[PDB]
Design a protein around this ligand. Structure first.
Ligand code: HEM
Length: 153
């Protein structure tokens, strides 16, 4: 629905449920990233050097917390305004990803890990409409971040 108010409402409620247990869901998210692309471990300071994904690391928690909140806020923004607006936070973001060695081809990795995270968080409440809602917000945000990366470089 390239975000109907009911699509927006679902992203908000699944985000709230996400954010109710940051320790568990952010740990789950990084397991899912490494299962999809084990080589991505090396990109994160808080991981590189560990055996298993840490369970009580505040840097891991703060980073995965920010990533999910920005997709959520992009979903509201698309629904309200019809676009994802660039800003200071997203151009700064463009600059940190270039520094960290994040490339365009990494985006599908974090997309699949997010969809799989959200499916586990909501359990039986999962729907095709929820999945298509997170998908659209992620893709539209990703477009705008990829631009800034292009531009940061
Ligand atoms: C829509 C998708 C994405 C969002 C909203 C996002 C958001 C962010 C944010 C908000 C930060 C923190 C910036 C700061 O305060 O310095 C961050 C850092 C970072 N992100 Fe992204 N990200 C996305 C995609 C990805 C992807 C695909 C990767 C790579 C697999 C990635 C890897 C990183 C790394 C390595 C850092 C630095 C974290 C650190 O060690 O502090 N991100 N991202």
């Amino acid at each position: 629905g390239a975000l109907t108010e009911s699509q927006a409402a679902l992203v908000k409620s699944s985000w709230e449920e996400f954010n109710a247990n940051i320790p568990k869901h952010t740990h789950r998210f990084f397991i899912l990233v490494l299962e999809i692309a084990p080589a991505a471990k090396d990109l994160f300071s808080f991981l590189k050097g560990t055996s298993e994904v840490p369970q009580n690391n505040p840097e891991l928690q703060a980073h995965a917390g920010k990533v999910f909140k920005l997709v959520y806020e992009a979903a509201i923004q698309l629904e309200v305004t019809g676009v994802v607006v660039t800003d200071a936070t997203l151009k700064n973001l463009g600059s940190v990803h270039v520094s960290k060695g994040v490339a365009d081809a990494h985006f599908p990795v974090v997309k699949e890990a997010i969809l799989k995270t959200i499916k586990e968080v909501v359990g039986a409440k999962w729907s095709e409409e929820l999945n298509s809602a997170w998908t659209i917000a992620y893709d539209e945000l990703a477009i705008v971040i990829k631009k800034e990366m292009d531009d940061a470089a």
